C-alpha cells in the first residue's frame, strides 16, 4: 500500500539523514538492506534477519 511506502521511504531517509548530520556515511550493505525494505522487497521481519546476518 502507498501509505506504507510513504512511511518506509521517510523512515529510511531519516535513518540516512540522521547519520549524515553526524558526519557518518553508512556501510554499503546497510544501504542495500535499507533500500530493499523502503521499496520494499522485504517485510520488516525479513529486513531484521538480513541486518542480523550482514557481514561487514
Amino acid at each position: 500500500t502507498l501509505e506504507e511506502l510513504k512511511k518506509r521511504r521517510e523512515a529510511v531517509d531519516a535513518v540516512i539523514s540522521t547519520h549524515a548530520l553526524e558526519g557518518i556515511a553508512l556501510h554499503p550493505k546497510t544501504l542495500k538492506i535499507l533500500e530493499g525494505y523502503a521499496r520494499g522487497n522485504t517485510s520488516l521481519e525479513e529486513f531484521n534477519t538480513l541486518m542480523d546476518n550482514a557481514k561487514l
Binding site: 521517510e10 531519516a14 547519520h19 549524515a20 548530520l21 556501510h27 546497510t30 520488516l44 541486518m51 561487514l56
Partner: protein, 289 residues
C-alpha cells in the same frame, strides 16, 4: 572512577559489545545496528509522557546492541561488566562554543524539561506556530545539556520528531543539512539569536515548505550532488535574494546566493519572468506575504 574508563586502554575507541578496538569497524557496525534499531523503533507506540525517561528509552533502543550503558546519562557513574567505573560530568569541546552542562547542571536541566512538558501537556492542542515556539526552547536546552556520553543528536532528533507527531505536527529533519544545523545552533549558543533556528523549524514543519525541500533534495540525489556542507533553506516571506538562477522543477525553483541554496515556490515567480529564464541568469526574488 574516570572518563577514561569509557575507552579501551591506549585507544580512542569506546568500549562496546562487539569488542571492536579498531575505530572505523566499530563505527560501521554501531552505525549498522543503530539503523536496524531506528527502523524497529518506528513501530512502537508513542508514549503518554514525554520526559527524561522517554529520552533514555530512545537512547537505550538505539544503542543497546552496541554499549552496555545504552540509556544511561553521563553524570551517573556506570560500572562496566569488566569492573571499571566511568562517568563524564564534564565533556570538553575542542574549539567550540560555551559548551555543555556540567554535572549537577545536567540533572537540574533534565528536571526542568520534565516539568515543562508536563505542565504544558506535551505541547498538545497547539497550532503549528505555537508548538514550534515552545519546542525550540526545549530543543536549545537539550542541545546544551547533551546528557549522553555519545548519540545525543540522534536521540534528541527522534525525541522531537515523535513529540511533534503526538502533538499533531511534524518536524522533518532529513531536510536539514549538516551546515544549516550548525549555523542555527551556534547562532543560539554564541549570538543569543533565535531566528535561524525558528526558520529551520518553519521549513521542516510547514507542509508547503516540506514539499519544496523534498523535491529539491530528491533532485540533488538524482543529480548525485552532495549538499550536506551547504546552506539549503526555503526563502523567508518578505525577504529579497539576489543570485544565480539554478533552475526549476514541478513544485519549486532554486536560487544560488553566495553559495547557499534558496528554495521558493514556482507560482511566486512572475510568469513574465519564468518564461525566459535560463540557468545562470542573475535574478532578484522577493518572497511574498
Amino acid at each position: 572512577i574516570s572518563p577514561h574508563h569509557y575507552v579501551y586502554p591506549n585507544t580512542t575507541t569506546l568500549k562496546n559489545k562487539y569488542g571492536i578496538k579498531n575505530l572505523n569497524a566499530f563505527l560501521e557496525k554501531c552505525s549498522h545496528d543503530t539503523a536496524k534499531a531506528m527502523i524497529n523503533l518506528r513501530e512502537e507506540s508513542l508514549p503518554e509522557y514525554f520526559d527524561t525517561a522517554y529520552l533514555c528509552h530512545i537512547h537505550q533502543q538505539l544503542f543497546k546492541n552496541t554499549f552496555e550503558w545504552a540509556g544511561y546519562l553521563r553524570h551517573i557513574p556506570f560500572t562496566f561488566a569488566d569492573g571499571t567505573t566511568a562517568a563524564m560530568p564534564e565533556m570538553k569541546r575542542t574549539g567550540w562554543k560555551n559548551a555543555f552542562a556540567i554535572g549537577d547542571e545536567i540533572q537540574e536541566g533534565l528536571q526542568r524539561l520534565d516539568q515543562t512538558l508536563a505542565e504544558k501537556n506535551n505541547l498538545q492542542g497547539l497550532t503549528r506556530e505555537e508548538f514550534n515556539s515552545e519546542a525550540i526552547e526545549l530543543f536549545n536546552s537539550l542541545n546544551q545539556l547533551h546528557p549522553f556520553r555519545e548519540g545525543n543528536g540522534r536521540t534528541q532528533r527522534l525525541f522531537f520528531e515523535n513529540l511533534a507527531k503526538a502533538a499533531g505536527h511534524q518536524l522533518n529533519f532529513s531536510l536539514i543539512t549538516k551546515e544549516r544545523m550548525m549555523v542555527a545552533s551556534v547562532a543560539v549558543a554564541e549570538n543569543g539569536d533565535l531566528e535561524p533556528m525558528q526558520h529551520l523549524f518553519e521549513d521542516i514543519s510547514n507542509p508547503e515548505k516540506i514539499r519544496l525541500l523534498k523535491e529539491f533534495m530528491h533532485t540533488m540525489k538524482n543529480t548525485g550532488r552532495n549538499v550536506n556542507d551547504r546552506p539549503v533553506m526555503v526563502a523567508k516571506e518578505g525577504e529579497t535574494y539576489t543570485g544565480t538562477y539554478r533552475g526549476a522543477g514541478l513544485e519549486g525553483f532554486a536560487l544560488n546566493v553566495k553559495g547557499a541554496y534558496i528554495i521558493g515556490n514556482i507560482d511566486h515567480l512572475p510568469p513574465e519572468q519564468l518564461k525566459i529564464l535560463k540557468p545562470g541568469d542573475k535574478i532578484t526574488f522577493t518572497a511574498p506575504k
